Write a protein that binds this ligand. Structure first.
Ligand SMILES: OC[C@H]1O[C@@H](O[C@H]2[C@H](O)[C@@H](O)[C@@H](O)O[C@@H]2CO)[C@H](O)[C@@H](O)[C@H]1O
Length: 137
């Protein structure tokens, strides 16, 4: 699986949908990013950063055409350079729930409300990708 990886969501996203990504962070990793795209927009951007002025952070946000909105920043950061990881996204009616290695990490309230239009996930950054899977209910 070559990264940047596009994972089609031809059904769009639906409540109860579960996306599971398995991989390994490369050595000396700078960033990871998951990008749920709807048309000209990024409905949900999940962006671990290994070094922003000597703190790890995960930045979350939504892009509407060329403009990023209000940043949500979170410090819980389970990833490590060289190490295997599992990221699970569960879609709920009012938010995306994100768990990393079987422990809950954050939730991100939908800003793009037409879930069925979110037709792709992009997986990029400093990772080897092993598998993807989702469940479309
Ligand atoms: O909000 C997610 C996007 O952030 C962008 O960088 C922001 C940066 O985090 C903030 O501190 C300030 O400098 O504005 C930057 C430009 O919007 C990234 O460029 C983009 O890729 C997203 O991760």
């Amino acid at each position: 699986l070559i990264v940047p990886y596009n994972l089609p969501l031809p059904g769009g996203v639906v409540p109860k949908m579960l996306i599971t990504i398995l991989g390994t962070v490369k050595p000396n990793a700078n960033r990871i990013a998951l990008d749920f795209q709807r048309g000209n927009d990024v409905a949900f951007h999940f962006n671990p950063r290994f070094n922003e002025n000597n703190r790890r952070v995960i930045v979350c946000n939504t892009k509407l055409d060329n403009n990023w909105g209000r940043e949500e920043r979170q410090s819980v950061f389970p990833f490590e350079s060289g190490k295997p990881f599992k990221i699970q996204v569960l879609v709920e009616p009012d938010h995306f729930k994100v768990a990393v290695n079987d422990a809950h990490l954050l939730q991100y309230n939908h800003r793009v409300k037409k879930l069925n239009e979110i037709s792709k996930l992009g997986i990029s950054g400093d990772i080897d990708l092993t598998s993807t899977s989702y469940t479309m209910i």
